[PDB]
Amino acid sequence: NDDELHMLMTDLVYEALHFAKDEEIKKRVFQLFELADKAYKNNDRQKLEKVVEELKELLERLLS
Amino acid sequence: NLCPFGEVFNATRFASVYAWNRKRISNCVADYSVLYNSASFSTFKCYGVSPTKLNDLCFTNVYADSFVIRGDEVRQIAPGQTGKIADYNYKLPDDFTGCVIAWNSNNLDSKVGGNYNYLYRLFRKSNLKPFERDISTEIYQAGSTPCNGVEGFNCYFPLQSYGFQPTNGVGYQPYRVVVLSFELLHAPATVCGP
Ligand SMILES: *[C@@H]1O[C@H](CO[C@@H]2O[C@@H](C)[C@@H](O)[C@@H](O)[C@@H]2O)[C@@H](O[C@@H]2O[C@H](CO)[C@@H](O)[C@H](O)[C@H]2NC(C)=O)[C@H](O)[C@H]1NC(C)=O
């Protein structure tokens, strides 16, 4: 679902910016947010899913 | 003179979480048995007080802070918790005294095409103070270069919407949340049980 996915995206962004101990991390996370925001508005499901996948890998690395 | 709980729990519209609505209750009879035993609530968590003893207490004030949040975020409406809601939208103090009541409102706040009228704050410069209502729409400054009020590269409108559609899974359902904050300071104790 597109709306569930958007809500997931924002959760990943919040956590990613919580554990973003390095400034470079924050920059990457913000970039990904911008891409997701655009994809959401234009109903591009594949692009939005791709950002979410990238955010998950990012966050998993930060947490582990 | 009964307390206007029917104006809180049965409200036609709940406020968005970024701008929660505080209803002050005083000088009335507060029957809490109807709220505890309603059996329509999925969450009923009290801090500093036992749910079944509420009718035996009298209060200086009762404040009902009402708002809509997402199912997975219900766990953040508690003292000592963190997360985007606990930190940027609705912060409860570590010594919070009161009861947090929530229920699944999918059949009320979710339209077939999706209800997008509920907003939350995703970006903020710092964490909220307990019970602070930040309803500013100033563009969030993510980068080092001043945004000057315009959205763009490393500049964001701080509020996001909740896409609540009726086909969502449980964690993505809307929940109506009412937090009853209790003041038990020396006072006339104007609002209390029957
Ligand atoms: C919140 O409202 C419910 C039900 O809504 C009211 O009753 C409907 C029949 C209709 O007239 C609505 O416009 C009203 O707002 C209340 O639940 C009722 O409680 C009474 C008393 O115990 C019981 O006899 C009824 O059968 C219940 N009806 C239903 C549908 O549950 C509920 O008590 C209200 N809660 C608060 C805090 O006001």
How many Å apart are CA B123 and CA B140, to the nearest integer? 6
**Contact predicate B125/B166, CB 8 Å:** no
C-alpha span between A52 and A36 (Å, rounded): 8
Q: What is the DSSP letter of A63?
A: H
| Number of domains comprising chain A | 1
In chain B, where the domains are located: 1-113+166-194, 114-165
Task: Please name the amino acid found at residue B75.
Answer: R
In angstroms, the Cα distances linking B102 to A4, B12, B68, B69 are: 20, 16, 9, 10
Does B126 sit in the ligand 1 pocket, CB within 6 Å? no
Q: Which residues contact B125 (CB under 8 A, 6 or more apart)?
A: B140, B141
Q: Rounded to the nearest whole angstrom, what is the distance from the C-alpha of residue B109 to the centroid of ligand 1?
A: 18
Largest interatomic CA distance in chain A? 34
Instruction: Report how far residue B173's alpha carbon sits from residue B9's, in angstroms, rounded to the nearest whole number.
Output: 18
Taking alpha carbons only, the member of B6, B39, B42 closest to residue B175 is B42
Strands B191-192 and B28-29: parallel
- B6 near A CB under 8 A: no
Sign of dihedral through CA atoms A47, A52, A53, A55? positive
End-to-end CA distance of chain A: 28
Strand ranges across the sheet with B191-192: B28-29, B191-192, B58-59
Tokens 């003179």 — which residue? B1
- Technique used: cryo-EM
The secondary structure of residue A64, as a DSSP letter, is -
Q: Residue A46 belongs to what domain range?
A: 2-63
C-beta of residue B178 within 8 angstroms of C-beta of residue B8: yes
- Bridge-partner residues for B45, per DSSP? B100
Nearest chain B residue to A18 by CA: give it.
Answer: B83
Q: How far is CA B13 from CA B33, B72, B74, in A?
A: 24, 21, 19
CA–centroid distance, B34 to ligand 1, in Å, is: 10
In chain A, the residue whose alpha carbon lies closest to the alpha carbon of B144 is A27
- Do the Cβ atoms of B3 and B55 come closer than 8 Å? no
How much distance in Å is there from the Cα of A37 to the middle of ligand 1? 41
Name the burial class of residue A62, with classes exposed (0-12), middle (13-18) and buried (19+) by CB atoms within 10 angstroms of its CB. Answer: middle
Interface check for A25 against chain B (CB to CB < 8 A): the answer is no
Resolution of this entry, Å:
3.5
Mind spelling out the 3-state secondary structure of chain B? CECCHHHCCCCCCCCEHHHCEEEEECCEECCCHHHHCCCCCCEEEEECCCHHHHHHCEECEEEEEEEEEEHHHHHHCCCCCCCHHHHHCCCCCCCCCEEEEEEECCCCCCCCCCECCCEEECCCCCCCCCCCCCCCCCCEECCCCCCCCCCECCEECCEEECCECCCCCHHHCEEEEEEEEEECCCCCCCEECC
The answer for residues whose C-beta is within 8 angstroms of residue A58's C-beta and 6 or more apart is A12, A16, A25, A28, A29, A32
Distance of CA B169 to the CA centre of its chain: 21
